[PDB]
Amino acid sequence: VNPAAHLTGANSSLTGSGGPLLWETQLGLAFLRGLSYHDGALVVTKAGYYYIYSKVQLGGVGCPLASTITHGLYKRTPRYPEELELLVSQQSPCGSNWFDSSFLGGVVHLEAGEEVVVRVLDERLVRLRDGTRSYFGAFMV
Amino acid sequence: VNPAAHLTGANSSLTGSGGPLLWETQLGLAFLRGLSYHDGALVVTKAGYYYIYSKVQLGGVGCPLASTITHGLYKRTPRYPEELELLVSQQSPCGSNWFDSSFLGGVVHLEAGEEVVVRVLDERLVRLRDGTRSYFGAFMV
Amino acid sequence: VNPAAHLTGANSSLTGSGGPLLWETQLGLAFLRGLSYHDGALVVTKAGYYYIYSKVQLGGVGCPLASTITHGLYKRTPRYPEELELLVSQQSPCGSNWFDSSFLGGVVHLEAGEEVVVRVLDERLVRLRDGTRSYFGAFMV
Amino acid sequence: VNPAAHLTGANSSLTGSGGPLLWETQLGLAFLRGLSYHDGALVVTKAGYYYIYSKVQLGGVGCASTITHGLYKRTPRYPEELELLVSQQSPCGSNWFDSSFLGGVVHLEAGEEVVVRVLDERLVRLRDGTRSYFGAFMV
Amino acid sequence: VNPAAHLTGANSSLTGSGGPLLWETQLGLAFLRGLSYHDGALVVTKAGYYYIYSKVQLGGVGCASTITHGLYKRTPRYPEELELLVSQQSPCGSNWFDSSFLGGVVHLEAGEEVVVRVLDERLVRLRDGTRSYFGAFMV
Amino acid sequence: VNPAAHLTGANSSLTGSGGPLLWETQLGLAFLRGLSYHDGALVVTKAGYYYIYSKVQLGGVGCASTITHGLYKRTPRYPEELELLVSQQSPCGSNWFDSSFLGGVVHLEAGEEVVVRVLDERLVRLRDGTRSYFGAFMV
Amino acid sequence: TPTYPWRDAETGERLVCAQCPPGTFVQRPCRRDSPTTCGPCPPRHYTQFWNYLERCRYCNVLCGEREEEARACHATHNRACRCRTGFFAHAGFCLEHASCPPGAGVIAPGTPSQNTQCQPCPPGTFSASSSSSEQCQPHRNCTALGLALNVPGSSSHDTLCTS
Amino acid sequence: TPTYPWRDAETGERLVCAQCPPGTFVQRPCRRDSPTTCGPCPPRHYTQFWNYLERCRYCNVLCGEREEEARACHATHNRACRCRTGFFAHAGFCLEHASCPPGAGVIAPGTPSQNTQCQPCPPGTFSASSSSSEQCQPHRNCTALGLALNVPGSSSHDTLCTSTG
Amino acid sequence: TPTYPWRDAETGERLVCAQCPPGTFVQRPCRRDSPTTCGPCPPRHYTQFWNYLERCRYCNVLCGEREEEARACHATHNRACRCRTGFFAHAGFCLEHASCPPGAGVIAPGTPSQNTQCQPCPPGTFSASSSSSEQCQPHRNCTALGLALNVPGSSSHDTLCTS
Amino acid sequence: TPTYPWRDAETGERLVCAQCPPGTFVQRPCRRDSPTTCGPCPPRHYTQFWNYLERCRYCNVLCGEREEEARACHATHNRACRCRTGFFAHAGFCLEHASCPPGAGVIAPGTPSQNTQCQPCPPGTFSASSSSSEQCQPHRNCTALGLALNVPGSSSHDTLCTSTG
């Protein structure tokens, strides 16, 4: 059984806490197969190389100049008390109302017990609609 | 044999019918291995989790305010007479002449007989060049 | 052992030569497993279908009208004295200062001895930060 | 003695009421010579052709987003204002400034009044009596 | 009796021909006092220095994208127009308005004519004779 | 004989020094009648109320990004300029043009001088003496 | 019948004359003896309200290529303009009515004051065309026809059925 | 009543099973001797058509802070959203209803689908405020009031009369 | 004490009068016999420098809703304005002080001339709030508390520790 | 003649095989006793150089509605596109040739690579139309015609003469 997961945007996705986004893990298109989840982090149970990915749908009305949106995938390990940046985009997409989408994919090595989370600063620009526009997944390669 | 496919932009890609895009399936870089194709839909013959993906290259001259472009991957099942949205971006990329590209990837579970198609509204903003800029693929994970 | 690799943006990434980008292959997040590397090209040692991908982080101050940025993945074979385009985006993202990110993924068949490289024209718009924002990888499917 | 006048932007110039702008008439560069003033209007007392003029300085941040600046006549013979000279500008096209100038010759009778309006008044920026003003002279 | 005039935008003002603009000379705020008019030109009959002026209201949707508005003299002594006072504006920077005002004193002889041109004329928006006009008075 | 003047943009008009603009006073459309000139200033010799005016043509490529165009008085009774009439424009909102016009009546005594300034001067575009100019007449 | 003050031009006592009604103006002011004389507005002129004008106001309003007279010049009113069929009024301009792209349909048609209003076609409905009149229609019901499903429908394509 | 093919697991005979109606899904397929068992859609799920799903589609639609439920998740229909009062729908966003400035008035109040509609105040009427509900109202009529005209009105300020005539 | 030229209004010889000091103007010019007479500036007027004005300059400067008097009108100077607390001066406008978004903190507070300055929170530090005062603080040190690490911190969230 | 290494499958000897020329590909590799068999590129494919492909590169280039074939797919070259008449190429798009407004005239007509070129009408010439082919033409010369000047010309309107002198 090769591990895989795809987590979707949900009603509680945007905590506003400065923490990572939360996701649906069971309903509609969301699923975990050989991965676990905890407070928005995917939790690795099988060591190996994973392609991780995330898309977030952004949008707003005008810019506040703070007009750069970062979207990123970050690793947590219990051996070091800080997160490690893995894959990150900066967009300034507001160049009235606007929509843009940010995608991230790549392969990283992950040990059992390590976790990956998704952060967007500023969180308020993420637009949830139906679970198909913002999401977070991975599978082992 | 692990299923995979990569279908490319082609001369007949844009039908204008409101239907899904069509693609090349045999020539140049296009290929099917353990997947089939029918009227623009990839057709699953082996049940499992697939990472599906699509990129479309967009472009134009100015905006018509109708200035939001949706790009999405949609599932068809014979058990329900409507399509299910899987993965979707909204871009308003025209913020004289412009180019933008939209990527979508993610994992979904697909049964044999189910199909996946790619829709862009509005279709007229997709720019074909050579099969390398708009495309649609998948492989099992 | 299934081949995989993920190469990161590095100090020497932008040669200015008109050649392909260079990448880190050993340090931090960069790795090769059953793929080799040479002068910015990933070098295939095992024939098969690969999902290849690349992200480059772009940015600048205003546009020079030359204001279209191409990002692409290109194949080299020893049987033909020219490169083959595989996957390509055009962005005109500067529509003061701006940031945009371009992602590319897709599956291609590669023989042993073939190579894949990443080109951005114009190279000067790529912004390196820390190896997490511009990158190039692949794995066999 | 040829009637003439120049009124300047003042602290009380924007009443926020939908009415005309008010102005300074006495201090600094403001003056009246053979014309009178009343709650924002030049009041004519010698009939004749007058070149009238006004300039308003406009400004804001971002963007209903069209601005009219106009000179308008009142006569007590008719219960509505008459438009004399008018501009529409949409200059919000972060910070912005733009100036609007109007001048033209009109015939005015003793008792008729001229005033200045801007919609939206909110966009007028006063600084010192030199950027927004209103005046006239007989020709 | 000091020559003066104010002509207003009219229904027939844009001929589409490359020629000058035409104007109303008699009705509403339009008038002629010691000046004449002819196929769009003020015609001088008393020699002197004149303040001349014109304002055109401009507008459109989106964007060759530069607009000239100018006042020009004709004399029968020379087979080409002379430029007197001119502006270039590129205000298309969806909907937009902008106004252009020109005024200045020039010396005119009996028989000389002044006219107004805008390129591209297409961008002039008439509304009511108050936003586009053309006038003069001797000084 | 009623004082009047119209000075035109000239080759030497932008000194780059922070000082006022210079102008042509004699050739083409430029003239002086009962006014004098001196290193860019109209110099008054007959006291009175004057309508003064100026128009500058502005232009550039892209974008400190606010432009002031103003008319200013000098009197030898006080060691600083007085601002009379002023506009701020930020029209850079690739190529762009915009014109600024100022007119107004002020009282001037014999010996007082008026000048024109633009900051940043760099943005003034001369072409032919018709797009940037400076003048006055007594009223 | 309202009134205005007037001095007699030679006697100089305050008289109180009657104003003239809409559609008219003061041809000749009142005097010692006779009431105010009111003439009717010449063509191309008006007075909408009671007044003491010595000359009617000019019908000064002009309609552009994309406008028609919503009210003609009349003795008692100026002309007014509205947009022609096909255009609507936005910021003092007559813009063309919008089309609703595929996957979206018309809920309210365009009018002289309002643009075409659109929406995404809800589930079970479609529109396959850019159009400024075509609305969200419901999918063909394969079951209510005694037919089996061929290809499912979407917001921009009708559901298909087989023989 | 539409059908889906099946096969008895014991014998192997082809079966023609009945589909399930809106509000249900196939919980058990038909057999030679019992019909298809249709289950009711559980909370947060739905089926809106005749169908043979082994599970109901999820009510996936989320409503933002500026939206409320036009329709609830129900067994026969997904949830659906419209804009709250104060807001209207432009291009997938919920924007604030514009105010008409001074000199202009509301001809149609804004709705969930539609923005405030303003014309400029016609002659003899006015609006002095920025408002998203104030309409062009008619000028104080001094002649109808028997009073003397003090200052005439405009599109943005009411006519003023004296207190006598 | 500087001076200016004057003709006597009836005799017409060049006299050399004294100017008037800041805060004053020439009520009456000098003559044959008497020195220049200098009056003080009326209210709302000024003269900042030595002069021979027949009327003080008017305090012409106006402060807007978002400005306060940095200097009042005075006999010797015009009024001047600066931005109120909360705003700073950018292009002759008083804009609101910026907030630093999560993942970034305040290094220099806003003032009347300068906007809030921000930066990304460096390693080992955080800010979990949009704020125009809140700065980059250091992560909770789990080890310097005799506690084990629960969840690691980031530029926008504090590190957590367990019992 | 360039070469690629190979190996006889029966014996095992190294071979030095010949490459195939433009317009062909390797259909069969060389052997000890027969040379490399070069096949002609099949329709819709090409090879433009000396090469040892086992299959020809595909003619992948597509021409939009605003383009036509500058070159056809041929066995020695991919297809290639230029803009149709009426259009020129800016930044991968095919834009419409600008018109020169009134007061300005064409100095160079637009091509597939280049947009219309306009100057403003020099003295003694004019253009009265927006056109993408009308050049600045010289004013009616009333003195050359022996006629009296009626109205002088400008950069955008022709001089007018009377019908006599």
Place this chain on the structure above:
Amino acid sequence: TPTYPWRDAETGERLVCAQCPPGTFVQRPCRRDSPTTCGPCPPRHYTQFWNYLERCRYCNVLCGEREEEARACHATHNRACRCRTGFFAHAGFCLEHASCPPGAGVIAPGTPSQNTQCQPCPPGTFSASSSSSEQCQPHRNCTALGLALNVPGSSSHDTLCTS
């Protein structure tokens, strides 16, 4: 030789005088007895056409820092300007000639009226430099040199060959 009407300044009969040719103006109008007297244009002035001006037109045109005289002032024409080498005329401005980025080459050089024209380098060709003169050159032909292929070329890099 065309003509103009004139009244004699004291007799007042219509005379028919000759105009003056380009490069000249009317120093003195014709009379009873003598033909029109034509003076030549002073410096800095002109008359391009036949005329009866009492003063030549002023050479009023000014060339800017990025312009040179395409025609000097002359008795019979005004000055005219074109762009200096390095710039071209776009909307009444002299912009700098463009560079063609790597992967694209020059087909037409810049001139005073036209910008540098570029294109993607077609197959078998390259340009490795941003430049406003450097064109698409063909790849090194490894086969036409008796060498084997090292690394293939692209639109922005030359093909490499080995010993």
Place this chain on the structure above:
Amino acid sequence: TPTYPWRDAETGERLVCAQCPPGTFVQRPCRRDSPTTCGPCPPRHYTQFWNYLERCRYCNVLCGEREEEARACHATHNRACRCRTGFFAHAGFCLEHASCPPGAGVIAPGTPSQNTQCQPCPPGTFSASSSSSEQCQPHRNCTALGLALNVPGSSSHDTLCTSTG
């Protein structure tokens, strides 16, 4: 001193091993009888906290042409960048320090974090140049110099006096 669990490989006893301090990493885990062996971080790597990495984190931070090293890669800290002289930091870019135009002067010079600060020249002062260091300076005072005023000054040009009085 913080700890991580472990297990002797011979016996199987649980161990409570010591973590490694900033500047080190775990090279060998603890055993029943020897403590954890902490290795020094090799060049180009670091650990900034107490930790149990089997390898140090890489100094991944790169400095652009417009940046210099605010901090070097060190065993206890990653590298870090600030803008070079002439430049300041806005939104992840290093922009050039603005010049104040004529009529305005520097109140604060620009730093790596902050752009040039300009006010307009207050009365009795001036600046005649675009400069990123020139401050509003006071006008030549003709009365303090005993000289006659020639031309008054402005915010952008100095007052001029004659050479006598």
